[PDB]
Amino acid sequence: TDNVKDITKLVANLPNDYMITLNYVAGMDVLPSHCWLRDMVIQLSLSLTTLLDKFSNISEGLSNYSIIDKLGKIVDDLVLCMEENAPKNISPKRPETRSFTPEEFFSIFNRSIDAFKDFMDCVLS
Amino acid sequence: CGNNVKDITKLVANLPNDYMITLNYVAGMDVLPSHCWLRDMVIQLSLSLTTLLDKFSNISEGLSNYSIIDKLGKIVDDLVLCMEENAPKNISPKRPETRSFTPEEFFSIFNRSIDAFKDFSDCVLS
């Protein structure tokens, strides 16, 4: 049901100097969403997959594995929707591989999901 | 003075496998007799835990990393008090080796220091 209310606890339970790697799609902060939403949900999917593998599945209490896994599932549904609707052949460039703080990584995450809630040319320079 | 862990296992399981935890490692801790390195190591763990703690927010419910680490830091404060109150005069072989360890490795050093404390030839190396 598009759920945060669990992201804040994850961020509070992740080291604030831990660098989460993400292939940031350039211009996600300026261009209209149809230009980057698809690519970004896919990149978030890859990063969450990579992130989840860094924890163990604690089953009782605050579990980072649990929250990340839940987030991964939400994104899989987003990738399904975006993919099974994207414009043919989606060749700008292959996203800037950057590392982000958990707070930063997850702010980007929220901005992408938010972008979905309103998903109804793409040039830079 | 002797002495409870609030579960390091859950902590290690809730910390990223590739997160590097910095520790000024006291050389010879793995071979030298305990009285040669315990005091210094307990002091070093205390510093690393201080630094580690400042990386998390205090989550109140759900056995958070902040709470467990904070608990481990207090246990070490008691251990530092004990070792300092009984440390030899002027404790200077050489400073500790600043290294980075994975959480499993860091807390393995911690558990081994704790054990050494639980059971507390002169200090020669090389």
From Swiss-Prot, chain A:
Q: Quote the subcellular location field of this record.
A: Secreted
Q: Which residues lie on this side of the membrane: Extracellular?
A: 1-125
- What are the annotated disulfide bridges? 35-122
User: Which positions are glycosylated?
Assistant: 57, 64, 110
What protein name is recorded for this chain?
A: Soluble KIT ligand
Q: Please name the source species.
A: Mus musculus (Mouse)
Q: Which stretch of the intact protein is present?
A: 34 to 166 of 273
